[PDB]
Structure 1
Amino acid sequence: RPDFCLEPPYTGPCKARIIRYFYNAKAGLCQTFVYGGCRAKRNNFKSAEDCMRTCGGA
């Protein structure tokens, strides 16, 4: 996996509730989290397919 797929999902300091996918590397699955709307990190996907292609492995 890229390193960044192992990082926790980052809500950040803004107060939107935007539902995004992250790769949960402990589960081996892309899952939802709540993104606050600014200062996104890389383990933050608008779709499950995006997340799987980047983080789900060979």
Structure 2
Amino acid sequence: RPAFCLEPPYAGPGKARIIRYFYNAAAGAAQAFVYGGVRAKRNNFASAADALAACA
């Protein structure tokens, strides 16, 4: 899988409260986190399905 799939989730400095998904390779699972709306990193998906498609 791509290296970015190993990133922990990055909320960023923003104050928005948007649910996004990251791939947790240790658990083999797409997991929800709260994203602040700015400065997204690569392991940041709109849905669990998208995270799994990219990283599973």
Q: TM-score, normalised by structure 2?
A: 0.94
Task: State the alpha-carbon separation in 2 of the partners of residues 33 and 54 from structure 1.
Answer: 17
Q: 2:49 corresponds to which letter in structure 1?
A: E
> 2:4: which partner in 1?
4
> 1:53: which partner in 2?
53
Map of 1:1-58 to 2, 5 A cutoff? 1-56=1-56
Q: TM-score, normalised by structure 1?
A: 0.91
For structure 1, list consecutive stretches of 5 or more residues without a partner in the other structure. Answer: none
For structure 2, list consecutive stretches of 5 or more residues without a partner in the other structure. Answer: none
In the TM superposition, structure 1's runs of 4+ consecutive aligned residues that sit over 3 Å from their partners are: none
Q: Deviations over 1:11-36 (max 9, x none)?
A: 00011110001001111100100000
Percent of residue pairs identical: 73
Q: Over aligned residue pairs, what C-alpha RMSD do you find?
A: 0.6
Task: State the alpha-carbon separation in 2 of the partners of residues 51 and 10 from structure 1.
Answer: 14
